[PDB]
């Protein structure tokens, strides 16, 4: 569907996060071969990234805004679970997620489809 | 505010009573749990008891500020614990409810 909330997530949330200076590691799936992480998919069972979320928003994949929000959440949570506390990537994730939450605070309150 | 009232009476109430919520209702007690490295790794402790008290005492100026505290609580859990620890699954479950409920908060 196309809803007011999903439009907000696309036009405000994804817009802000996609172009952020710390976004680059999150713009495509974690490539375990490229990064040399043979345990990544053993630990992270549901990979998620902003390229996938962006494509899903562009293709009207989501039925509800909550579904998109859960994908954002999974992406960040995967990062915190896999990486060491002191890794820079954790700081980058935290910075992006703070923006996510700040913007989500102003999202339309009721979901409804555009005719 | 309208949003802070919602975070207190709708969001926090639902999370608080959940069967996986008990570890999160008060600060992590590193002494009781025997974890000398907890406060060396987690520099901003947060829990729902602290958030609830802040809501009750009008500490927050905006809903976003309160939401950030919820996020810090969950993130601390993911950062400190092993991926396979049950507490991680408990946090994930509560976090999903948090986002579900936040989606329906008044927009202002
Ligand atoms: C295992 C490292 C890692 O964990 N989460 C992300 C994102 C990354 C990442 C880091 C650098 C480039 C691309 C992804
Ligand atoms: C260090 C373990 C831990 O990490 N986050 C929480 C919450 C807990 C916790 C686990 C059991 C009881 C109380 C808190």
Curated annotation (Swiss-Prot), chain A:
Tell me the compartments it is located in. Answer: Nucleus; Chromosome
- Give TM regions: none
Taxonomic path: Eukaryota, Metazoa, Chordata, Craniata, Vertebrata
Top-rank taxon, per record: Eukaryota
Name of this chain's protein: Bromodomain-containing protein 2
The record's comment on protein family reads: Belongs to the BET family.
What else does UniProt say about it? Some specific inhibitors of BRD2 that prevent binding to acetylated histone are promising therapeutic molecules for the treatment of cancers or inflammatory diseases. ABBV-744, a small molecule, has been tested on tumors with success: ABBV-744 antiproliferative activity is mainly restricted to cell lines of acute myeloid leukaemia and prostate cancer and is able to displace BRD4 from chromatin. GSK046 (iBET-BD2), which specifically inhibits the second bromo domain, is a promising therapeutic small molecule for the treatment of inflammatory and autoimmune diseases.
Q: Which organism is it from?
A: Homo sapiens (Human)
Outcome recorded upon mutating residue 5 to A: Loss of homodimerization
The entry's free-text remark on domains says: The first bromo domain specifically recognizes histone H4 acetylated at 'Lys-12' (H4K12ac). It also specifically binds histone H4 acetyl-methylated at 'Lys-5' and 'Lys-12' (H4K5acme and H4K12acme, respectively). The second bromo domain recognizes and binds histone H4 acetylated at 'Lys-5' and 'Lys-12' (H4K5ac and H4K12ac, respectively).
Q: Which residues bind a protein?
A: 39, 82-84, 87-88
Outline the subunit composition: Homodimer. Interacts with E2F1. Interacts with (acetylated) STAT3; promoting STAT3 recruitment to chromatin. Interacts with CTCF; promoting BRD2 recruitment to chromatin. (Microbial infection) Interacts with herpes virus 8 protein LANA1.
Which residues of the complete protein appear here? 74 to 188 of 801
Give a short account of what the protein does.
Chromatin reader protein that specifically recognizes and binds histone H4 acetylated at 'Lys-5' and 'Lys-12' (H4K5ac and H4K12ac, respectively), thereby controlling gene expression and remodeling chromatin structures. Recruits transcription factors and coactivators to target gene sites, and activates RNA polymerase II machinery for transcriptional elongation.
Tell me where in this chain the Bromo domain is found. 1-107
Gene encoding this chain?
Answer: BRD2
Curated annotation (Swiss-Prot), chain B:
- Give the consequence of mutating residue 81 to A: Abolished binding to histone H4 acetylated at 'Lys-12' (H4K12ac). Abolished binding to histone H4 acetyl-methylated
Q: Where in the cell is it found?
A: Nucleus; Chromosome
Please tell me where a protein binds in this chain: 37, 80-82, 85-86
Q: Domain named Bromo: which ranges?
A: 1-105
Relate the outcome reported for changing residue 83 to D.
Abolished binding to histone H4 acetylated at 'Lys-12' (H4K12ac)
The residues the entry assigns to the signal sequence are none
Q: What is the effect of changing residue 102 to E?
A: Loss of homodimerization
The record's subunit annotation is: Homodimer. Interacts with E2F1. Interacts with (acetylated) STAT3; promoting STAT3 recruitment to chromatin. Interacts with CTCF; promoting BRD2 recruitment to chromatin. (Microbial infection) Interacts with herpes virus 8 protein LANA1.
Q: Which family does it belong to?
A: Belongs to the BET family.
- What does the domain comment read? The first bromo domain specifically recognizes histone H4 acetylated at 'Lys-12' (H4K12ac). It also specifically binds histone H4 acetyl-methylated at 'Lys-5' and 'Lys-12' (H4K5acme and H4K12acme, respectively). The second bromo domain recognizes and binds histone H4 acetylated at 'Lys-5' and 'Lys-12' (H4K5ac and H4K12ac, respectively).
- Record-given protein name: Bromodomain-containing protein 2
From which source organism is this entry? Homo sapiens
Q: Which span of the parent protein is shown here?
A: 76 to 183 of 801
């Amino acid at each position: 569907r196309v809803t007011n909330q999903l439009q907000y997530l696309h036009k405000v949330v994804m817009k802000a996060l996609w172009k952020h200076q710390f976004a680059w590691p999150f713009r495509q799936p974690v490539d375990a071969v490229k990064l040399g992480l043979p345990d990544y998919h053993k630990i992270i069972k549901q990979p998620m990234d902003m390229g996938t979320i962006k494509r899903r928003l562009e293709n009207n994949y989501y039925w509800a805004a909550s579904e998109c929000m859960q994908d954002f959440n999974t992406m960040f949570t995967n990062c915190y679970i896999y990486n060491k506390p002191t890794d820079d990537i954790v700081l980058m994730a935290q910075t992006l997620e703070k923006i996510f939450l700040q913007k989500v605070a102003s999202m339309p309150q009721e979901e409804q489809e555009l005719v």
